Amino acid sequence: EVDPTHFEKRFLKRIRDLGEGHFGKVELCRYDPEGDNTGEQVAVKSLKPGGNHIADLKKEIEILRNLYHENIVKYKGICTEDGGNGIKLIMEFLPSGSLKEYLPKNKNKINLKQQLKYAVQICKGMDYLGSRQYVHRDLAARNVLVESEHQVKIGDFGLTKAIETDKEYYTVKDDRDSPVFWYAPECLMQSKFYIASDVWSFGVTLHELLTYCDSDSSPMALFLKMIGPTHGQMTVTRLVNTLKEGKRLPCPPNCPDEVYQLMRKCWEFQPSNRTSFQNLIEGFEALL
Ligand SMILES: Cc1[nH]nc2[nH]c(=O)cc([C@H]3CC[C@H](NC(=O)[C@@H]4CC4(F)F)CC3)c12
Numbered sequence: 449e450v451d452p453t454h455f456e457k458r459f460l461k462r463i464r465d466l467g468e469g470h471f472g473k474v475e476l477c478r479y480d481p482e483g484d485n486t487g488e489q490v491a492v493k494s495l496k497p498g499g500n501h502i503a504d505l506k507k508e509i510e511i512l513r514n515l516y517h518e519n520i521v522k523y524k525g526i527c528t529e530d531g532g533n534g535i536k537l538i539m540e541f542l543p544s545g546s547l548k549e550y551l552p553k554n555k556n557k558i559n560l561k562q563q564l565k566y567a568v569q570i571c572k573g574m575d576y577l578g579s580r581q582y583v584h585r586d587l588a589a590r591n592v593l594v595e596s597e598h599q600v601k602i603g604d605f606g607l608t609k610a611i612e613t614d615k616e617y618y619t620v621k622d623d624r625d626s627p628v629f630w631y632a633p634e635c636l637m638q639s640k641f642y643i644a645s646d647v648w649s650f651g652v653t654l655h656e657l658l659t660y661c662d663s664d665s666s667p668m669a670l671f672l673k674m675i676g677p678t679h680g681q682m683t684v685t686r687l688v689n690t691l692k693e694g695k696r697l698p699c700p701p702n703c704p705d706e707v708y709q710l711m712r713k714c715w716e717f718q719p720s721n722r723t724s725f726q727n728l729i730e731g732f733e734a735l736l
Contacts, residue, residue: 509535519573521593524539547590566600578643629687647714674695675690707735
């Protein structure tokens with residue numbers, strides 16, 4: 449009898465691209481064994497043509513296989529290489545896509561109440577992750593998927609890493625294409641990643657969410673307005689120095705102050721003096 453978490457390459461047919469990075473990409477595929485365009489749609493993550501990167505995909509697969517939560521995207525299966533070494537990650541396709549693509553088109557349908565509900569839902573997926581001894585390192589609006597207008601999910605686990613029991617953080621080596629405008633100062637300075645660093649990133653993600661992922665008011669474009677548009681190599685050190693001074697992203701327009709103070713609490717300098725995902729749920733719930 450057949451394994452349902454096993455997708456043969458021959459039946460996996462590409463439709464379009466959904467996203468890519470400097471290492472791997474995610475496509476839309478129909479798994480169509482019958483060969484009649486009736487099969488189920490899926491998100492297929494794979495590597496671009498990388499010895500060190502096949503290791504990373506296997507880890508990601510094995511992390512995502514064992515996460516079971518309403519607000520985390522669902523592992524469907526794997527597709528193996530015919531020789532052995534290569535591999536693909538098969539996930540559920542959510543056709544409304546990331547918040548980045550969704551919010552600009554559905555501003556009429558989505559109001560402050562609904563944005564705060566998404567926010568709660570992101571904190572619940574993130575607290576499940578954290579409690580399973582994992583640090584995400586990549587929480588942006590672009591990795592939050594829309595299941596429906598009442599449901600979002602964390603849809604990417606590319607940079608997700610185990611924190612050891614003894615240690616209280618993870619130290620990264622390959623920081624080369626990091627999302628710097630989403631990062632806490634310890635990530636920028638010591639290359640260190642605490643659960644509290646994911647909370648930093650949530651605050652920025654929450655900023656994007658509250659501005660309907662308008663490019664013109666995005667974390668990059670507002671940080672680059674503050675520090676300087678054209679500093680090249682010195683961008684990241686100049687970012688670290690404005691955060692040291694106490695400069696943070698401004699209140700989104702039509703965001704009430706009480707929401708903004710929950711956002712501000714995400715962005716305290718020291719990881720230990722920073723709010724928790726549980727505390728954030730209770731603050732959002734009280735507003736709703
Ligand atoms: C997983 C998934 N299920 N359903 C989807 N519907 C969508 O519209 C888009 C996506 C993903 C969202 C995350 C993106 N992640 C990357 O680009 C990272 C750099 C990389 F590794 F490619 C990929 C596309 C969907």
